C-alpha cells in the first residue's frame, strides 16, 4: 500500500465472545471487555482509510501451542461444555483456586480445573469463548505473516486481548497470549531476536512469564504500579528475568495521575533498551487504557498523545506488529487506537 | 444419659452475609446463622448439659496458629473495602495464580486474593467479631476439658478447618480446631490428635501441623478430585520432614454410606490408638448427611449416634468443634446425636 498506510487484520468471530457477567466489587456487572470495543476501532480504521482490512487465515493450534501448554489448550476447548454438563446455571467463573500452601495438582472436577487454570474471577467463559480466542490468535498470526512477507507494520485488531495469559493460565480478560504467539512465530521463522513492548496500562504478566528465562525475546512493560492495580503479583521493577533471561525483562512502573509528559520518559527508557537489544522484529502489545477517561485505569494520556506514541515507535525502525489489548472508554477507543497507527504512519 | 457442656456465643449472628458466589451466580449463602440456632435449640431441648458463653482469651492463642499479618488483615478488610468504594460484599476477584509471586500488595483487592483460597466466603460487617467469638468458643471448650470435663462441645460459627495460618476460605477464617489443639500443647499436653469427620478435607488443619509430629492430623472426606478443597486432601499426603507419617487422609467416593465410611473411621481410630495422644480434638461436620445440599455421602441421622459412641471409646479428653452441615432441618438432630451417642444414647 502507499506510504502512510497500514493494513489491519480483523475477525468478525470476535463477536462469538459476548459474556453477560463480570465479577467486580462483589457484584456481577456488565463486562468491560465488550464487543463494541472492536467494532468501534474497526469503524475508525475504515473511516480514516488507514489501509486494507483483511480477515485472518487459519493457522491451527500449532503456533498457539508453541507458547501455551497442550493441557491448557484442551481445557479451553472443553471448559464450557463441561460446565453446562455439570449443572451450573451461570457463566463459567472460578470459585476456588490453588491457594498459598496447596498443591499445584490438576483435579478431575471442572470447578477445580477452572481455578487451576486461572488467576482471577472477572473473566467469565461462555459459549463462543473458545472460537473467539482462536480467531484472535489467528488475527495476530496473520498480522505477523503480513510483516514477515514485506509490510513494515500491521495492526492485529485482536479481541479478546492476550497479554495477561500465561502458558497455562487465563485471566485479565485474556486467554491466548496473542503478542507472545506473534513473537514466537517471528522466532520460528528465523528472526534471531524479538522485542515485545507492552504499552497497555496494565503489566503484561503473561508475556513476561512466557519468556522470563530467555534472552532471545526481550519483554518490556510500562504500567500502573501493581501494588495498586491488577495484576498485583507481578510487574515490579525488581523482576529482571531468571537464568539465561536475566537482564532481558524490564518493568517500568508509574503512580496514579501520570500524564504523557512523565510516561514518555519511561517510553524513552524502553526505546533505549530496545536499541541496545537490537531485535530483528518488534511486537507492540497496544492498550489505550492509559487514556485519561479510562474507567478502570489511572493514567492521563490524551487522544493526541497517541499520535506521538505512534510516531516514537516508528522511529525505532523495526518490522512491527501491533496487537490490541485493553482500552475501555468506548467513545474514544477508536480515535485513540487508530491515532497510534496514524502517528506511526506520519500523521500530525 | 451422661451430660456434656456446650459453649455458644450469640455473637455468631454478627456474620450474616447475603451473597455467595456459586456456579457463576450470587446465591443465598449455605453457611447461615440458622445452622447454629437450630443446633442450640436441640441442645436445650435434649437437656444435653449446661450451656456457657465463651470467655475472652484475646488474640494470643489465635496467633499461636495464625500469622500476625493475617489477623490484622481480617480486622481491617471490611473497612478498607468500603473506603475503597466497593458496593458489594468483600469477595476476591484476583489471586496469586500459578507463576506469580507470593508478594503482599498494598491494594485491598490484592490482599483479599493473597489471603484467600476461594471466592465463596464473602466478608462483611461483623465477620471479624463473629470469627473472634468462634475462636473463643473453641478455647473455652478446651479450658473446660483441661479443667476436668471429659468432653465439651464448641458450637462454633463460623467454622474453622479450611483456614490455613494465613489463608481464609471454605466459610472459615480462624482454625478453631487447630487453635484448640495448640492450646492443649501449650498447656503441657505432649501429644494431640485432630480427627476431622466433616465431609470435606480439613486442609487448613493439615497445613498448619504438616511438618510436625506432636499433632497427628487425620481427615475422612470426599475425594478432592471431585470436591472442595481440590488441591489438598489426597491419600499420598502423609506429612513433611519430621511430620512424615503424622498426617492421614482417608478418601471416599460419591454415595458412600456409614457401613463403608465407618471402616475408614476404624482405621483412623487405630492410628490414634498407636499415636496415644493426651487430648483429642474432633472437627465435627454433619455434612456427611444423606440430604446435605453440597456433599455426597449417605449417613443417616441414626449413624451420628454410632459415631459419637465410637469416639467415646477412644477414651480421651475430647473437644468437639462444629464445622460444616447444611441441611438445616436435620442439623440439630444430627449434631446433637453425636454428643448424645458420646454420652451413651443408642
Ligand atoms: K503495559
Ligand atoms: K525475556
Ligand atoms: K474431614
Ligand atoms: K502433623
Ligand atoms: Mg465441582
Ligand atoms: Mg483495587
Ligand atoms: Mg432435610
Ligand atoms: Zn490494560
Ligand atoms: Zn464440610
UniProtKB/TrEMBL annotation, chain A:
PANTHER family the UniProt entry points to: HISTONE DEACETYLASE 8, HISTONE DEACETYLASE HDAC1-RELATED
Keyword Nucleus among record annotations: no
Binding site for Mg(2+) 3: 293, 329, 331
Residues noted as binding Mg(2+) 1 in the record, renumbered to the chain: 109, 111
Binding site for Mg(2+) 2: 293
Residues that, per the record, bind Zn(2+): 200, 202, 289
Annotated ranges, domain Histone deacetylase: 33-341
InterPro entries per record: HDACs (IPR000286), His_deacetylse_dom (IPR023801), His_deacetylse_dom_sf (IPR037138), Ureohydrolase_dom_sf (IPR023696)
Cofactor(s) the record lists: Zn(2+)
Gene3D superfamilies: Histone deacetylase domain
MF GO annotations: histone deacetylase activity; hydrolase activity; metal ion binding
GO BP of this protein: epigenetic regulation of gene expression
Family: Belongs to the histone deacetylase family.
Domain of life: Bacteria
Alphabetized UniProt keyword annotations: Hydrolase, Metal-binding, Zinc
Name of this chain's protein: Acetoin utilization deacetylase AcuC
Signal sequence segment: none
Amino acid at each position: 500500500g502507499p506510504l502512510g498506510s497500514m493494513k489491519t487484520v480483523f475477525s468478525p468471530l470476535h463477536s462469538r465472545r459476548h459474556v453477560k457477567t463480570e465479577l467486580d466489587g462483589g457484584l456481577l456487572i456488565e463486562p468491560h471487555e465488550k464487543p463494541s470495543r472492536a467494532e468501534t476501532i474497526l469503524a475508525r480504521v475504515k473511516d480514516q482509510a488507514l489501509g486494507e482490512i483483511l480477515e485472518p487465515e487459519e493457522f491451527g493450534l500449532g503456533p498457539v501451542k508453541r507458547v501455551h501448554t497442550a493441557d491448557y489448550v484442551s481445557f479451553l476447548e472443553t471448559c464450557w461444555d463441561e460446565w453446562v454438563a455439570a449443572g451450573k446455571r451461570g457463566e463459567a467463573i472460578p470459585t476456588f483456586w490453588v491457594g498459598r500452601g496447596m498443591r499445584a495438582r490438576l483435579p478431575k472436577d471442572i470447578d477445580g480445573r477452572l481455578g487451576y487454570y486461572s488467576l482471577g474471577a472477572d473473566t467469565s467463559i461462555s459459549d463462543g469463548t473458545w472460537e473467539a480466542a482462536r480467531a484472535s490468535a489467528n488475527v495476530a498470526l496473520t498480522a505477523q505473516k503480513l510483516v514477515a512477507e514485506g509490510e513494515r507494520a500491521a495492526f492485529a485488531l485482536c479481541r479478546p486481548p492476550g497479554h495477561h495469559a500465561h502458558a497455562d493460565v487465563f485471566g485479565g480478560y485474556c486467554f491466548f497470549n496473542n503478542a507472545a504467539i506473534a513473537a514466537q512465530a517471528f522466532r520460528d521463522q528465523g528472526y534471531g531476536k524479538v522485542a515485545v513492548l507492552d504499552v497497555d496500562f496494565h503489566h503484561g504478566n503473561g508475556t513476561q512469564a512466557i519468556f522470563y528465562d530467555r534472552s532471545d525475546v526481550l519483554t518490556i512493560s510500562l504500567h500502573g504500579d501493581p501494588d495498586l492495580v491488577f495484576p498485583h503479583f507481578l510487574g515490579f521493577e525488581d523482576e529482571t528475568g531468571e537464568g539465561d533471561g536475566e537482564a532481558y525483562n524490564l518493568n517500568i512502573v508509574f503512580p496514579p495521575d501520570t500524564p504523557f509528559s512523565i510516561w514518555s520518559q519511561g517510553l524513552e527508557k524502553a526505546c533505549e533498551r530496545i536499541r541496545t537489544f537490537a531485535p530483528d522484529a518488534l511486537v507492540v502489545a497496544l492498550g489505550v487504557d492509559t487514556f485519561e477517561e479510562d474507567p478502570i485505569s489511572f493514567f492521563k494520556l490524551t487522544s493526541g498523545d497517541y499520535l506521538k506514541l505512534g510516531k516514537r515507535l516508528e522511529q525505532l525502525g523495526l518490522p512491527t506488529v501491533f496487537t490490541m489489548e485493553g482500552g475501555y472508554d468506548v467513545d474514544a477507543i477508536g480515535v485513540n487506537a487508530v491515532n497510534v497507527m496514524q502517528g506511526f504512519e506520519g500523521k500530525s
